[PDB]
C-alpha cells in the first residue's frame, strides 16, 4: 500500500505431500503455489508458502534442485512436512537448505489408531538440528502452539556487531572525527556521526570532531596521538595528506555503517570489478529515494566511474523499490550495486545479502564501491 | 534519502543570456545545465534550472524547439530572462509555454545610466500574463522579493473539486454505500468510505452503510429511493444484479478517488486501449510500494486482463520510484498506467497528469483501468 | 521527561525479609523504599518496590494493615519474598492482596546443603495462586527467567468487550446514528462514529448516519423498524422527541465509550451524588488537556451543574496530569470525576478505576456524569 | 483534547463601543467576554477576545485598570476599535499596552456619507505604531484583508539568538564537553549535547566530547588550551577540582539551553530567593511529565533544597498541565519555578516570561534554580 522508509519473514513447507501436508497449512493458523500469511511470536508477522510445481517428482522420486533452489532462495527459513518415512526426496531438501545456509524444521500427521513415532530417525538421518515436530490434521495441541517457540529459536537473531572492537577505552584514546562543510539540519548532525561519538563514549574513550581546515592546527598541538580517525568522501584524501600518521589507522563513515550490514563479502564482491568484461550487465539497486536532477550517485557517479575505470560495453539496469528484486530480473547479472541508506536494519540487509550469495551473484554497495574507487584499503581496522 | 509516503516545485528560467542572466541565477536567492535549489513562499521549497545547451541559437536565431520541449515538459512554471527587446527566440519559448499549458513569467537587468525601460512592450507583445519584471543584477529590492509573490499567484492553486456534484441535501437524499468484506484495521473503514460518509452529511443527506448480503433487504424494505449507491470491485456487479434500479446513478469507490486527480484525460486514455497493436508498449507505474507475493494488481493481473482484453505482442515495462520517470525511459509507450493510492495529492497527481499530456503519451490509471475492463460506463454521474 | 499522548506496570516485592529479600532486587536483573526499574517479557517495561518501612513489625508480628493499603492501592500486582515458613505476617499480606483484588506471587532463597523445600506449605496455606517460586542469591536458572512467564500469566490480560452485546445480525438490523453539526477535520469522522460504524458491519448490521433535521423524515419513511440508535449531547432530546419509539434502546457515542473502560462502577459511583453534603470535595481529574478558554466542561460546567443539581458549599480540586494522583491529594474526597477522552487503552484506565476501588472513593467521568446529569437511564442495553 | 508534547496566539480587540466594535468580530472572519477563535497568516490560527465588563466606564470615562490589566496579561497584542476621537479611555488602555509591554494596533468603522478620516490623528496622538487602520461593517476590502499582515509585522518574531556568542573561530578554539555517565538511548545522544557541538562547527571550532575520568588526561596533555567547558549536574564541581583554568569561562548545558529561553529574568529572579520569608508561597510549574516515584526533582529536591536554603514555613504549589495556569491560581506568588525541559520553542518561553512580568511576579526554572543553589556564578560568559 505504503508505509514510512516491515520487513516481513518469509517461510516455505515443503514436501511431497499435500492433503497430509496442506491440512498443515490452512489450517495450524492462529504461476500455482499458495502464499498465505499471518502471525505468530516469538518473532512477527510472516509468510507460509509451499513447494509449488515442486511437487512433480522423478521417476527415482528426485527434487528437481535447479528449480527448488530458483524458489529456496527468499526464504528465511523453512518446514518440511513428511508423510512417510526418509526418502531420497526428504534428503534432497534437506541438502539444499543446508546447501543454501537456511534453518529449517520437520514435521508430520500423526495418527492414533496403531501407535507409531518415526521421528526418531530424523532426529539424526536428515541432519538434526533437532527438526523432530509431532503434529496432525486432527489439530491437536502441538499445532500453531509450540511450533513458533523453538522456530523462532530457529531463525537468525542477534548479530549485533560492536560499531567498533578496537575501542581501547581505559586511559582513553582519542577518535578524530573529521567532517565536511556541515550536514543539516539546524543543530544536528548526521546519525552516523552521533553514533560514532556514542560509542567512543561507550568506550570511556574521547571524541573530537574537527573540521577540515583545522586538521593541521589540532594535530601538530594536541599531545595526545590518535588511534582512530574517521571522514566521508574525497576528504579522507586531504587527510591522507596530513595523515599525518600512517600507523595511524583511519577510516569513512560510509564504510562503518558498511560494516554493519556485512562487510565481508561487500570487498570480496567489490574487488570482482576487475573481471569485468564488454558487455556484462550491473545491477544499480537503489531503492526508494528521492533522486537529485543533478549526478544522481547511484545512476550517475557510479555507472559513470565504473566504465572509466574499466572497459566500456557495459551494461547498467537500476532497480527501484522497498523489496528486493525478483530473480527474473537479476539473474544473469554479474555484479549488483546496493545503496546503503536505504535499508538501516542490519537484520534486513543480511537478508538481502543472503539471497545473494545463494544465487551466486556478488554484491556490493555505494559505500564500499566508491571507497574501492579511491582506495579501500587503509580502513584495515577489521582484520580477524 | 527516504521518507514518509515532498512534492518540490520545479522552474525554468529560459533566455539567451547568461551573464545578464546567470546573475539572475546563484544571486537572487534567500548533462550541462545548472539545477540549483532553495526555497521561496507563499508556496515552497523550490528549483531553478536554465536552458542547458538551449542556448545555442539558429542562424535565424530561433528556439529549438524538439530540444526545448523535451526540457519544458517537467517544469512547474517557467521563468523567461531577456537581455534585448523581443525578438524570434522571445517570442518562440512562450509559444511553447503557451502551447504546453504551462505558467510564467518575464524578467530584464535594468542599468540605470540610461534611464530605459522595455516591459511596455512584453505588457502586450509576447502575451500578456502581466509577466513584467524590472531587475538587476545590481540586486536591488525587486530581486528575490516581491517576485515570489505574484509568480504564486501564477502557479496552478485551489483546485479542490467537490467529492461530489449531484450530492442533492435539504429533504435529504440517502447515499448506499456498499462495501466488501472488511478492510481492515479493528474498529476502522478505509478512508475512501469514511470520505463519502462526511461528504453526505456536509451535503445534508444521509449515508447507508451495508454489506453485500444485505442488499436484497434493505433496498427492497426502505421507503426511501437512493440517490446514489457507491461499491468497489466485482462487487459492483452482484448489486448491478438488484441493481435493483438503473434510474439510480452508482459507481466505484475507486472511481470517485479517481476523479479527485483529473478524470477526463483517464477515461479519454483508457479508452484507447482498442487501438493497441501488437509490439507496442506499456508502461505500469506502480510507484513505491508493498508488492504481495500474490497476483499483484500492477504487475500481474492488468497486464493479464490486458494481453487477454486485446491482441497479445504487448510489451510491459513496470516502473517502481517516489518520482515519475525521466522520458528517457517512457518515450515512445503508447499508453501510461499509474497507481491510484500511489499519489494522495491531487495537486501532486495534475502534475503528472501535466506531464504526460505534454508528452502527448496518454496516461490512465490502475481504478480507471479495471473500470473500464469490466464497465466503467455506469458512474455518469459527472456529464457537465 | 515528555510524550504523545507509556503506561508502565507498577509491582511490589513484599516481606520482612530483606538480606534473604534484597538479593532478589538489585540482582534478578535483566522517603525510605527502593523504587527500581527495569523490562521484562511477555508484558513490557516495569517497576518493582520494596515494602519501605512496612519492614516494621508488631511485638506479635503482624503487617501493620492501614500502613500497607496506602501502598499497595498502586499495584498491578505483587510479589512475596519469605525467609521461613508461614508465620502472621505472610498471611497478612495475602489477606490484602486478595482483599484488594490485586495479584500476586511467591519466592524464597533455597540453600543447598540441607536439602529443604516449605513451597508444598504455601501450594496451599496462603491461598494457593499456585505462587510457588524456588530461587537463590546463588542466582540460579530460576532466576530473572521462568519468573516473567507465569507472573505475565498473573496479571490483568484481555478484557476486549465487545464494543456491542445486542448487535443482532442475520437478517440485518439498522442502527442509526445521529450526528451533531460536524465534528472536524475535512473528509473525516470522529473515531467513535467510526468505531460504530465498523461494529454494526462486523456484526453483519446495517449502520445509517443522519444528521439531526433528517431524523423526522429518516424515521417515518424508513420502512426498517431500527433496534439501535446513537448519539451526544443535549442532541439525545430532540430525538427522545420523534424518540420515536421508545420500545427502540437508544444511547450515546459518549457513553459507548465509556462501556469500555469499566461501566457499572461509574454508574454506581455516579448516582452517588446524591448524597453530597455541603463541604464535601469533589476531586476533577482533567489529565493532560488543550483548556478552552470558553466553559471548560471539566472545569466550570460540571462544577456548575454540579451544585445547581444538589446544595452548594461542595469544594472542588482539579487535577492535571498524565499520571494518576498522589494519594495524599485525593484521601478524603467523596467523588473522583475523570475525564473519558483523555486515557484511550481500557486496560490502562482499569488500572485507575481498581486504585480509587482500593481506596474506596467512588469514581465516575465527564460522560456517564453529563449523561446522569439529563437522563443516563434509558441507555439500559446491558443489563446482564 | 490531546496531542504530541500547538501554542496558539492570543488576542484582545479592546474599545467601549460594541456595536460598532462587535460587527469588526463575528465578521471580518476567514464570565461574560466572547473568545472566538479563527486563522490568519502570516502568522497562524489565533483568538480574539473582547474587553468583557472592561464596557463599563467611570463618570469621568476612564478605563478601570486593575480590572483591565487582570485581564490583558495573557494577550500576545491588542486591537483597539474606537467609535469616536480620541477620549481618555482611548489613552488609557495604550498606556498599559505601552506599559505592560504589548503590541497592539488600531481600527475604526468608516461610514461614507459624510467623507471623515481621523486616524491622521491617533497616526501621532496615542502613541504611534503607524496603528492606523480603516475599516466598516461594510466588510470592506481592508477588512479581514489586508490586517492580519502589518498585524503580523506588529508580533513577535525571530529572536533566535546565538546558541554562543563567544564562539571564537579562525585558528580554531577547543571546547570541551564532559558528559555524565551514558544518556540513553543506545547510540544516541541527549540534543543539548548534540546542538553544541554542531554550533562549535558551524562556528569553525572544534569539539571534544570526554567522560568525568578522563577530564585528568585530556587536559593536561593537549597542548591546546580550551576557551569553553561545558557539563551538567554536580558533576560541575569535580571539573571545578581539575577546574584546571579558571581563566578558562565554563558552564552548564543545563544552563546555555536555559539561555534560549530569556535568561537574565530567571537570574534576576531565582537570586531573590533570600528575600523569602516564612509562609511565603512558591510556584512549582512541572507542565506535563512523566513523574519519578523517586526523588522528583520539581516536587521534592528542589522544594526541599529550598527550605534548607532558607527559612522553612514555606507554602508550595506544584501545578501541572500544558498550559499556562489562571492568574487566579498564582496571583500572590512570590516566585515561580518553572520546568525547563517542558517547553522548548523559546517563542513560547518568552509567550510565559513576559506573562509573568506583566504580573509582577519574579519567574525562573529548575535549571537556574538548581545551579544557583550551588554555584550558578562561574558561567559569566554572557556579560554584555
Given amino acids: 500500500y505504503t508505509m514510512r522508509l516491515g520487513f516481513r519473514r518469509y517461510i516455505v513447507v515443503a514436501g511431497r505431500r499435500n492433503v497430509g501436508k496442506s491440512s498443515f497449512m490452512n489450517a495450524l493458523v492462529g504461476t500455482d503455489p499458495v502464499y498465505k500469511s499471518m502471525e505468530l511470536h516469538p518473532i512477527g ?11 512433480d517428482v522423478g521417476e527415482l522420486g528426485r527434487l528437481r534442485v535447479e528449480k ?12 518440511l512436512v513428511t508423510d512417510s518415512a526418509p526418502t531420497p ?17 520437520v514435521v508430520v500427521n500423526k495418527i492414533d489408531v496403531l501407535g507409531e513415532k518415526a521421528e526418531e530417525l530424523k532426529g539424526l538421518y536428515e541432519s538434526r538440528y533437532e527438526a523432530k515436530v509431532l503434529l496432525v490434521s486432527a489439530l491437536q495441541k502441538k499445532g500453531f502452539d509450540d511450533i513458533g517457540k523453538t522456530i523462532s529459536e530457529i531463525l537468525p537473531g542477534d548479530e549485533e556487531i560492536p560499531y567498533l572492537g578496537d575501542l581501547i577505552d581505559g586511559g582513553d584514546l582519542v577518535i578524530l572525527v573529521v567532517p565536511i562543510d556541515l550536514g543539516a539540519p539546524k543543530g544536528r548532525l548526521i546519525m552516523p556521526q552521533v553514533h560514532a561519538i556514542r560509542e567512543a563514549l561507550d568506550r570511556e574513550a574521547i571524541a573530537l570532531v574537527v573540521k577540515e581546515r583545522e586538521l593541521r592546527y589540532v594535530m601538530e598541538n594536541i599531545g595526545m596521538k590518535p588511534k582512530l580517525v574517521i571522514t566521508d568522501s574525497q576528504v579522507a584524501m586531504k587527510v591522507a595528506s596530513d595523515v599525518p600518521e600512517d600507523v595511524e589507522l583511519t577510516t569513512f563513515s560510509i564504510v562503518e555503517s558498511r560494516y554493519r550490514g556485512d562487510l565481508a563479502y561487500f570487498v570480496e564482491s567489490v574487488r570482482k570489478i576487475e573481471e569485468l568484461e564488454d558487455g556484462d550487465t550491473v545491477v544499480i539497486m537503489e531503492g526508494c529515494t528521492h ?3 543533478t549526478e544522481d550517485i547511484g ?10 575505470h574499466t572497459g566500456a560495453q557495459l551494461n547498467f539496469k537500476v532497480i527501484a523499490g522497498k523489496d528486493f528484486p525478483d ?21 534486513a540487509m543480511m537478508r538481502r545479502v543472503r539471497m545473494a550469495k545463494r544465487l551466486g551473484i556478488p ?13 579501500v584499503l587503509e580502513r584495515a581496522i577489521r582484520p580477524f
Wanted: net charge negative; charged share 25%; with cysteine.
Fill in 291 to 293: 533522486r537529485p536532477l
Fill in 299 to 308: 545512476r550517475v557517479k557510479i555507472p559513470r566511474w565504473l566504465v572509466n
Fill in 45 to 55: 508477522p510472516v509468510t507460509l508458502v509451499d513447494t509449488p510445481g515442486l511437487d
Fill in 89 to 105: 526426496y526428504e534428503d534432497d531438501v534437506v541438502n539444499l537448505f543446508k546447501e543454501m545456509e537456511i534453518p529449517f524444521v
Fill in 68 to 79: 527448488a533452489r530458483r524458489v529456496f532462495y527468499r526464504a528465511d527459513c523453512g518446514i
Fill in 327 to 347: 530473480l527474473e530480473e537479476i539473474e544473469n547479472a554479474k555484479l549488483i550495486i546496493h545503496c546503503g541508506g536505504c535499508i538501516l536494519n542490519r537484520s
Fill in 363 to 375: 554484491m556490493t554497495n555505494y559505500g564500499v564501491t566508491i571507497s574501492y574507487l579511491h582506495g
